[PDB]
Every structure is written in structure tokens, then in C-alpha cells.
Amino acid sequence: SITDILSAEDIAAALQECQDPDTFEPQKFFQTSGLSKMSASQVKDIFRFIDNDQSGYLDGDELKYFLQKFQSDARELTESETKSLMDAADNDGDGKIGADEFQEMVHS
């Protein structure tokens, strides 16, 4: 979902740095460790971190399930955590985070 092409250690720190239900559990994981200096392609694999697609794209509602996808026992990114994901790409006019949208953030 990310380890395809990324620094494994930096991931933990990247994630574990400020992680919490309101700081940036996914974005930090990606950015600090991986996204910071990665091409668009690998982002495809990274993108897989959050939701897979569900119906063509990921959305603020579903974003909480990203953990419930594999861990099927997540906390549901609380009210705040999904903000991270929401703010991850299509936040200003779609509230959805798709691979393309996600790629846009790193490319931004």
C-alpha cells in the first residue's frame, strides 16, 4: 500500500511523529517518508494506503473505512482524522480522494 516504493523506517517516524485522530495519520506517513520525493507512478501504490476505490473514488464518508478495509476494526478516523484524508486531495470541491486526486497533492 506504500512500501512498494518508500523508506520503511521514515514511514514509522513519518507516521508516528505527530500521528493522532486530527493531525495527519496518512498524509504524514506518505509525505514525510515517501511522498516528499517520489514520482507520480509510485503514488498509485501509495494511494492504496487509504481506501481502494469503493465506487470509483474515496470520500470523506468512506475515508474512515480505509483502516477497516484491511484491519476491519478501525476507529473510523473519528471526526478529525478523515480531515487529513479529506484535505489529502479533493477537499475544496469534491471531498473525495482518488489516486489521480491523491497524485495531484504530491504533485502540487
Curated annotation (Swiss-Prot):
The keyword DNA damage does not apply. SUPFAM superfamilies: EF-hand. Found in tumor tissues and not detected in normal tissues. Ca(2+) 1 binds at residues 51, 53, 55, 57, 62. One of its GO terms (molecular function) is calcium ion binding. GO terms for cellular component: cuticular plate; cytoplasm; extracellular space; protein-containing complex; stereocilium; supramolecular fiber; vesicle. The modification N-acetylserine is found at residue 1. It comes from the Eukaryota. InterPro entries: EF-hand-dom_pair, EF_Hand_1_Ca_BS, EF_hand_dom, Parvalbumin. GO terms for biological process: cochlea development; response to wounding. Keywords: Acetylation, Calcium, Metal-binding, Repeat. SMART domains: EFh (SM00054). Residues 38-73, 77-108 form the EF-hand domain. Ca(2+) 2 binds at residues 90, 92, 94, 96, 101. Pfam families: EF-hand_7. Has some calmodulin-like activity with respect to enzyme activation and growth regulation. Binds two calcium ions. Belongs to the parvalbumin family. This is Oncomodulin. It comes from Rattus norvegicus.
